[PDB]
Amino acid sequence: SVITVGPYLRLHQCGLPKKMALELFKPFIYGKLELRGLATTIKAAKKMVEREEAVVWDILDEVIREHPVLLNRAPTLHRLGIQAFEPVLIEGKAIQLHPLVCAAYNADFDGDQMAVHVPLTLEAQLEARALMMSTNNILSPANGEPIIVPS
Amino acid sequence: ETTQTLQDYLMWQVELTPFTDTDRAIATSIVDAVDDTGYLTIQIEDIVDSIGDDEIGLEEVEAVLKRIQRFDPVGVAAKDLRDCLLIQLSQFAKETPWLEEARLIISDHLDLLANHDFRTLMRVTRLKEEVLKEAVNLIQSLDXXXXXXXXXXXXXXXXXXXXXXXXXXXXXXXXXXXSANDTLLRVSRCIVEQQQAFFEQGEEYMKPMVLADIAQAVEMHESTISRVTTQKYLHSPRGIXXXXXXXXXXXXXXXXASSTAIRALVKKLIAAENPAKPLSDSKLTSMLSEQGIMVARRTVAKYRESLSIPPSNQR
Amino acid sequence: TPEEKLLRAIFGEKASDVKDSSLRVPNGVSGTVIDVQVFTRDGVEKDKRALEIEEMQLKQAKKDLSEELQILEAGLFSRIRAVLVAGGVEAEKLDKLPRDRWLELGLTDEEKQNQLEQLAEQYDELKHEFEKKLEAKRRKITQGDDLAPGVLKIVKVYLAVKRRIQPGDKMAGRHGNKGVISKINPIEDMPYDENGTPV
């Protein structure tokens, strides 16, 4: 999707459009609908998915939570080119990115298109919250001079 | 669109519903008997004997099969076709204008005589006015029940072969389409043009054609003439049917049609006939003998009753 | 097998094994249908709704070709109305008796031969000429074009979608300025001048 800047979303977070979030976390939706006790069959759970009741989004709120997501450009010129962030549901057709870094991604906003990868596994969560999340790396691996300088 | 179908998707649906051990084993034993129609479980005694005893009674497999019948494409497997209809009626609505009850009366029994016509059965079910007709409309709105797979997006067009054009009261070949290749195609476009000149579709059927005549014309080998027309299909302005206008016979008579008009016009004469249910093969053989085709009545009855013809079972 | 014949008796065979292939629209597409054409090959015996656009186009051609000879016919009736004044002028009578008032008898012999021959001759050639153009264009309305040897008929449907601006944006200026909408901003919280007009 296309990236749009906004004056919020503390350094670990990203604006995730609600239309994009429902389909990516869809299997977790099936799981927690079959779990919390409102369900009959998986196909009827799907029926609830495309009927989009107001309770489904209440499920998704607890689905996303502490389980961040990966961001990828088409080019990656270094390690920091890809980072993970905590999704926050936002109304729109565009994705919101944190303003403080225009550097590691190297691209300003002309309407460039951005990729979003979702790892699941189990330990992929910790692997995402340890060696990836942007708040862990404030420095560049080739220098040591602080990146994410305000401008 | 290069997608998995049949027991791949059905078995993938079976793996979703949790089955500890036995339900999974007998489940996989059920899913393999599904056919293109989907409602044929064939003999249940074969599924029971295939388990090789060691308990697993019939009562345990009955609920498993009933669970197989509840899958995504409504009615699945079961038996007798009278089962899946009940499942189609149970999960359809559950709130209906008295369609559920009468649906169980019609689907239960008596449906065999009610399919051709109602008549006296209208007094059996006690329904009247538009309730019975609307119920029959519901039965007509139900459903083969499955056949939701396939997903046949593409058709494999014939793409023709060689072509012809009718001039001043005469049809001539042209071989229109698209040096050794040009002449190689000119031979087929030549012998094919002369074959289209000697054979005219004309009016009503086609003139009988003998491979010995087309082979005697250009002195070409009949094996190579009919060998190419077997695989390839010559596309004319009407029809599709190239080898059909090649293979024939001498009709074994001086006053005559070939097997093409013999079987064709035989089924055409049998099309309009039997004011009620004559189903008379000897009468059709006499009608064929009245035209001078020299029919022994043995070949006309056996050859005429074949190829989708209702005969002789129409009696 | 018999149960197949029973199934064919129930629903009238319901086309039976004949397949389901259709034109059904892929997702991500909405809106209404602008127009439907459905061109057909010669001798297909189409009937269906394809004759409605034939009659519609015929009405358009008739309405387009009518006004020309209505104006020119008004000119013919204007010159006849001019020559009938020279003699034997019945005024409102001739005004209440249309269609040449049956030639208005013979009047003078010169006006008989000249006026009658010119009026009937020109009028007949205009009517026959309009009929000729209408029959030729009629041959143009109903016909068929060249087509692949393996196609019978082709259906064509048009669609339309209304799309409204959203944060995706990407509007551009004439000076080379790109950009995208950051947010959709309500009216009340935006700055305004001394007169109260918001930006």
What resolution in angstrom units was achieved for this structure? 4.1
Residues 6+ away with beta carbon under 8 Å from B225: B191, B211, B214, B215, B246
Q: How many CA atoms within 13 Å lie on the side-chain side of C156?
A: 6
d(CA A98, CA A89): 14
- Nearest-Cα distance to chain C for A124, in Å, is 32
What is the SS3 assignment for chain C?
Answer: CHHHHHHHHHCHHHHCCCCCCCCCCCCCCCCEEEEECCEECCCCCCCCCHHHHHHHHHHHHHHHHHHHHHHHHHHHHHHHHHHCCCCCCCCHHHHHCCHHHHHHCCCCHHHHHHHHHHHHHHHHHHHHHHHHHHHHHHHHHCCCCCCCCCCCEECCEEEECCCCCCCCCCCCCCCCCCCCCCCCCCCCCCCECCCCCEC
- Nearest-Cα distance to chain C for B80, in Å, is 10
Q: Which CATH architecture has domain C45-144?
A: Helix non-globular (6.10)
d(CA C72, CA C75): 5
Are B106 and B121 contacting, i.e. CB atoms less than 8 angstroms apart? no
- Say which experimental method was used: cryo-EM
- Which among B115, B158, B235 has CB closest to C10? B115
d(CA B211, CA B63): 63
Residues 6+ away with beta carbon under 8 Å from C188: none
Residues 6+ away with beta carbon under 8 Å from C156: C36, C37, C38, C39
Strand order across the A69-72 sheet: A83-85, A69-72, A115-117
Task: Report the b/e string of B25-37 with b at 16+ CB within 10 A.
Answer: ebbebbbebbeee
Identify which of A69, A73, A81, A53 has the alpha carbon closest to the alpha carbon of residue A17. Answer: A69
Chain C neighbours among A 104-123 (CB < 8 Å)? 109-111
Q: For chain B, give percent helix, strand, coil, nearest 5.
A: 45, 0, 55
Q: Report the phi/psi class of residue C135: left, alpha or beta, with left for phi > 0 and alpha for psi in -120 to 50.
A: alpha
Would an 8 Å CB–CB cutoff place A99 in contact with chain C?
A: no
Residues 6+ away with beta carbon under 8 Å from C93: C101
- Nearest-Cα distance to chain A for C161, in Å, is 17
DSSP A81: G
Q: How many CA atoms within 13 Å lie on the side-chain side of C13?
A: 6
| H or E, element range at B116 | helix B111-116
Would an 8 Å CB–CB cutoff place C180 in contact with chain A?
A: yes
| Strand ranges for chain B from DSSP E | 164-166, 171-173
d(CA B39, CA B146): 8
DSSP letters of B40-73?
----HHHHHHTT-SSS--HHHHHHHHHHHTTSSS
